[PDB]
Ligand binder design. Structure first.
Ligand SMILES: [Mg+2]
Length: 132
DNA sequence: GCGAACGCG
DNA sequence: GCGAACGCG
C-alpha cells in the first residue's frame, strides 16, 4: 500500500501553457518541504518533471533513501528517460521554463540515484498530499 | 511523416 | 481545449 515515509510532489497550473508552481510535501504530515515560486509560462508536464527532479536533488542533499510519489505517469517516464519530451516552443516567453528543464536534464545526466519514483494512485488513494 | 482519432484547468 | 502518448503513400 502507501509508503508514508516518502516525499509527494505536485504542480499548480493556471493555464497550460500558463503560470506554473510546484511543491514537495511530507506524505505523512503534509509539511511543505520545498516550493517553487510562479514561472510565468510552462506546461503542466514540464512543471511535474521539474517537481520530481527538485525532489531527487532535495533527498540526495539530505542523505535520504525515501521514495517520491508523483501523480504524473508522463513526468515519471520523462525522468526515467532523462528527457522532458515537451512540444513547447523555445522563444523569449518560454526561456525560463526551458532553462529550468535543461538544467534538470543536465542534473539527471551527471548524477546517479536509487530513489524510487512511484505513481500516486489518485482514483484509489485520493488526492496526492502536494495537490494545490 | 501526415493529420485524425489520461487528467486536468 | 490543452499537453501528453489508425490508413495511407
Ligand atoms: Mg494536482
Amino acid at each position: 500500500e502507501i509508503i508514508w515515509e516518502s516525499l509527494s510532489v505536485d504542480v499548480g497550473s493556471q493555464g497550460n501553457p500558463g503560470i506554473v508552481e510546484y511543491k514537495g510535501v511530507d506524505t505523512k504530515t503534509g509539511e511543505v518541504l520545498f516550493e517553487r515560486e510562479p514561472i510565468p509560462i510552462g506546461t503542466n508536464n514540464m512543471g511535474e518533471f521539474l517537481a520530481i527532479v527538485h525532489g531527487l536533488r532535495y533527498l540526495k542533499e539530505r542523505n535520504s533513501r525515501k521514495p517520491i510519489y508523483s501523480n504524473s505517469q508522463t513526468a515519471i517516464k520523462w525522468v526515467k528517460d532523462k528527457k522532458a519530451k515537451s512540444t513547447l516552443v523555445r522563444n523569449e516567453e518560454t526561456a525560463l521554463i526551458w532553462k529550468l528543464v535543461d538544467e534538470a536534464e543536465e542534473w539527471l545526466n551527471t548524477h546517479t540515484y536509487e530513489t524510487p519514483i512511484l505513481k500516486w494512485q489518485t482514483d484509489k488513494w485520493g488526492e496526492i498530499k502536494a495537490d494545490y
